[PDB]
């Protein structure tokens, strides 16, 4: 069937799938933040790092994903060019904050697993709070400084028209921004996470497997969600017209979804498990 109505169905069908994602992203992180904020037994260094990730993921399905839903289903932009400039800046700021924090929990956790005596003495709260400031300082620098200041802008006529058009909100970057930002937001944190969980797997070698299944869920769900999108960013930088917007957006949305997983991966502690149910009016 192909009329002028069969389209207004796949739209409502995609439209509710998006509204699940947006809720799952919010619910999971509003629960994780309140858990750490209300329960004392959850005030660990590693948990300060779960928090920074939980605010990064909450802002995804709060300011980015909802507008993402719109722009797509609207099949256009209804917020103007400065709000386009702004929204694009949140998008990058949150993706960098999500991925940096994922790799900061990674180094931290390996340091405590490998050397718990150095960690206990060295990594303070007033050291950890400072790690987090830096995470958001770069996140900001890679997002608001180059997008907002026009340092990201493309030069080809197609983009020049889009940048001028208030109903246009297609992201067009110059060969260098896309590479530089991809290395900062993703590959550096990927490399770090690769060799950090590498030394966890190696120094370790029944109980050995179900715990090693874990760093497999961790490193996996992360790659399975962000490597597709970022390898495509590099391919599209080299060979122009080799990636379809259909594909590029579909790939970004997979990563947008990772933000909903993080609560399920990082908050599996028995104290989280206890905290969550008490808040969900089950315990006590």
């Amino acid at each position: 069937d192909v009329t002028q109505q069969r389209d207004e169905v796949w739209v409502v069908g995609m439209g509710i799938v998006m509204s699940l994602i947006v809720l799952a992203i919010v619910f999971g992180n509003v629960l994780v933040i309140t858990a750490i904020a209300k329960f004392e037994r959850l005030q660990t260094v590693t948990n300060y790092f779960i928090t920074s990730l939980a605010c990064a993921d909450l802002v995804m399905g709060l300011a980015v994903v909802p507008f993402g839903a719109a722009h797509i289903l609207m099949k256009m932009w209804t917020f103007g060019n400065f709000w386009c400039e702004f929204w694009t800046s949140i998008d990058v700021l949150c993706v960098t904050a999500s991925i940096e924090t994922l790799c900061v929990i990674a180094v931290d956790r390996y340091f405590a697993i490998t050397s718990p005596f150095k960690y206990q003495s060295l990594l303070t709260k007033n050291k950890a709070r400072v790690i987090i400031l830096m995470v958001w300082i770069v996140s900001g620098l890679t997002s608001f400084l180059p997008i907002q200041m026009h340092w990201y802008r493309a030069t080809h006529q197609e983009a020049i028209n889009c940048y001028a058009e208030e109903t246009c909100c297609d992201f067009f970057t110059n060969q260098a921004y896309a590479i530089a930002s991809s290395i900062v937001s993703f590959y550096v944190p990927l490399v770090i996470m690769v060799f950090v969980y590498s030394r966890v797997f190696q120094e370790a070698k029944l109980k050995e497997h179900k715990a090693l299944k874990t760093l497999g869920i961790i490193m996996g769900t992360f790659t399975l969600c962000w490597l597709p999108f970022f390898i495509v960013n590099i391919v599209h930088v080299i060979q122009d017209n080799l990636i379809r917007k259909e594909v590029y957006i579909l790939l970004n949305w997979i990563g947008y979804v990772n933000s909903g997983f993080n609560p399920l991966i990082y908050c599996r502690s028995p104290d989280f498990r206890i905290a969550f149910q008490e808040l969900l009016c089950l315990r006590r």
Partner: nanobody
Amino acid sequence: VQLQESGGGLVQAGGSLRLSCAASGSIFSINTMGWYRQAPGKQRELVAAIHSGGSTNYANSVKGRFTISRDNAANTVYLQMNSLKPEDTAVYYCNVKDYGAVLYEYDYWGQGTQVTVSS
């Protein structure tokens, strides 16, 4: 899985003892087995700990005297307490910290081996 402590009991001051603790069961390859002492109606304080890779953390008071070691075959810890002063009289507990699930540490405790250093 349970922690099987022994070596506890009365001993003359300036004496010696060997506290042993067998972690009966499956415990992940990366872990820290240590000793914790409950002073007469006071707070629990770590005596000495040993990581399953090789590194220590003796509580500065027992440093020089008491010496912690471990077997990675059966997973048993030996705090050889020499020159036992009446300040060392406390309930000693066995404890294993368990890394992997790699994000948090599963804490395993023991019932406690009483040590009474008499003068």
